Amino acid sequence: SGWKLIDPISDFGRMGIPNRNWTITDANRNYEICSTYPPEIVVPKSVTLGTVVGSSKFRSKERVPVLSYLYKENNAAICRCSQPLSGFYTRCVDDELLLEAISQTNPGSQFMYVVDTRPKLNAMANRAAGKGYENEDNYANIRFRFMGIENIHVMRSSLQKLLEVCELKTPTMSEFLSGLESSGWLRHIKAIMDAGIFITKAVKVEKASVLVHSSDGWDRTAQVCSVASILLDPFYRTFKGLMILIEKEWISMGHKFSQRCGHLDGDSKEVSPIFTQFLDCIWQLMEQFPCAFEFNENFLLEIHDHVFSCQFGNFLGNCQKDREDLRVYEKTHSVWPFLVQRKPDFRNPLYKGFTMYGVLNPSTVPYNIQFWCGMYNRF
Amino acid sequence: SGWKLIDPISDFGRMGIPNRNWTITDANRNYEICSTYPPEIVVPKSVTLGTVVGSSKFRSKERVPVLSYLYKENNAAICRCSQPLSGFYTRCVDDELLLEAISQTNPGSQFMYVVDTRPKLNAMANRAAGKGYENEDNYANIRFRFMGIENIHVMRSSLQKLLEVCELKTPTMSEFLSGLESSGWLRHIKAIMDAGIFITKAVKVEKASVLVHSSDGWDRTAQVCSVASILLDPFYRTFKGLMILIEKEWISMGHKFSQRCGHLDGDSKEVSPIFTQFLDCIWQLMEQFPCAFEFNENFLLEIHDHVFSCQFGNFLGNCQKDREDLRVYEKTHSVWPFLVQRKPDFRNPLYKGFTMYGVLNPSTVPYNIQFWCGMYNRF
């Protein structure tokens, strides 16, 4: 019952789903569509199972396009998936049909964005290894954009570089700022945010739906989709809101916490501070909007702690099927009740409530993107 | 009548003065000892009038050693002055004696500190111009220390570089970071803080009294003395406290606000962000101690706003005499009352009260000395 406190799928309820446009399939009830997706997924109503599975077989690791967020007010939505398996030549009808079907849930807009979170160069590299990205020729009325966020290896490097600098024996400012710049860390934070802001404007301003993918659709995809949601919707700026976004977009959707956070092996090329960057992105917004969020800096820092402590079950393993196999929902407890106990210590006292802010328009002029002391004092 | 709300001398009372070691002399009542000092001033009890004037004539601008702050618990004190007129060889019994009287108001410590805020190369250039600095060989148990804080033309050039960076058209994170390093601004605010922390640790840990001087004793001497004061005493972290600190150490002691803040001539080589740097240092402490200060970021910024707006009277003129002779007391209003009526907007919700903190112990590792958006968004 501790576990019934935060149910990711209720959030779909909150955006008026199911409806004329979107339904919740249990088709993945036994992980038959995709082994790293949740049992329940949301796809367009107008699509058959055969089209979903056929798309699945054209997406990397079967991570088929699936809804992440719907903006009630204008019906624009954000979807997420892995990269396509197109190479230089291959097309797939069921795939092309599924993206065609997503855009049709927003008849208003004449085109749909396909946002690729990667740099063009990396997308090209993956295309040469039999993967790649969608072609504007084979996908009717799409507008392809690269976001340019680097991969997990570059991120692990960047953080390693920054901590090495921060631990220097009595350094000057010029030494420190030189090292900060070298690490690239704030470039990476700034990139993720900018990609968030791009998608936000796509959805709010242009009223256009967006399909987001990275390579595997579970690192940069989770970051940038989450950030966009926090930008669009006040709900995710609340205790329950954020608790929910994390269970939905990170935990259930199969960000590999056990591998990324080193629960079993810390010396692996699979370790990377991807969830850290996401919390950092929320921190940046809090700094820029001292009144917009219900929670304070401490909330994020405690969440970050238990992502690593393994004190709770929420973040164990690398997907929902893993967690089900670990019997985690029966034999362990959930963070969220535990953190709800401690809300007194987590409340932003400058918070101006739910109805105050709508969509946030931060600036990412670099003097706004700052080193986060409270965080790079826990490493 | 609002011109009486904040009275500087009252702060001497608060530290228990007059007493067995310190008095308020009337000697400068008609500004005949020092023209740029205020009418009342604090010197040791054991000192004669003849020694005070004798010393003043061996100090640049006649800005003789006077008391800045007495740490009651310790009897260790902080005095301030201008550089001595000792050149290469000349000495002065009167100046030597007045420094020994200062140290003999704190008999517990076998030595007194003398703190030169300048880098030694500057102090040497001043020596070659017939001024300079004290020789440990000519003075009673002094340990002489350079703080390395650069001059006003450097500070001016620095802020000027920094703003040029910030208003660059869409800079990469790298361009900004490299420009922030080049401007040197954070190097300067760190040095100031480090000077403050040096003094602070002298008084608290070693129970050693400190004489602080620069060249003219009214820019760097004010920054450093003030920062050490905030670090030692909670009183200056309250609303009234800081208004008193600014009246006492900055306005009454003759920091040339009009020349500095560009009231008269903005093109002047005399313009320099000295007070700006000071508010920055307070904010840096507020960020490291979000519960220690009664006021918030806005209190500093509004204060700063008016120092430049010339809407009230308090920062007009370059010292007390200028101020009295222009009759500003009579012709405009004080800022301080005007700010008390707006305290709702200045309060720090996380303030844990007066007795919760003692001597603050900040870190000046370059990563927690940060760029202040609030401030360089006003320029």
Swiss-Prot record, chains A, B:
Domain spans labelled Myotubularin phosphatase: 2-376
Described function: In complex with MTMR9, negatively regulates autophagy.
Predominant location: nucleus
Positions bound to a 1,2-diacyl-sn-glycero-3-phospho-(1D-myo-inositol-3-phosphate): N126, N151, I152, S215, D216, G217, W218, D219, R220, R260
Keywords, sorted A to Z: Coiled coil, Hydrolase, Lipid metabolism, Nucleus
Protein name (database record): Phosphatidylinositol-3,5-bisphosphate 3-phosphatase MTMR8
Originating organism: Homo sapiens
Active site residues per record: S214 (phosphocysteine intermediate)
Catalytic activity from the UniProt record: a 1,2-diacyl-sn-glycero-3-phospho-(1D-myo-inositol-3,5-bisphosphate) + H2O = a 1,2-diacyl-sn-glycero-3-phospho-(1D-myo-inositol-5-phosphate) + phosphate; a 1,2-diacyl-sn-glycero-3-phospho-(1D-myo-inositol-3-phosphate) + H2O = a 1,2-diacyl-sn-glycero-3-phospho-(1D-myo-inositol) + phosphate; 1,2-dioctanoyl-sn-glycero-3-phospho-(1D-myo-inositol-3,5-bisphosphate) + H2O = 1,2-dioctanoyl-sn-glycero-3-phospho-(1D-myo-inositol-5-phosphate) + phosphate
Modes of activity regulation: Interaction with MTMR9 increases phosphatase activity.
GO MF annotation terms: phosphatidylinositol-3,5-bisphosphate 3-phosphatase activity; phosphatidylinositol-3,5-bisphosphate phosphatase activity; phosphatidylinositol-3-phosphate phosphatase activity
Binding site for phosphate: S215, D216, W218, D219, R220
A GO-annotated cellular component: cytosol
Amino-acid positions noted as binding a 1,2-diacyl-sn-glycero-3-phospho-(1D-myo-inositol-3,5-bisphosphate) in the UniProt annotation, renumbered to this chain: N126, N151, I152, S215, D216, G217, W218, D219, R220, K256, R260
Subcellular locations according to the entry: Nucleus envelope
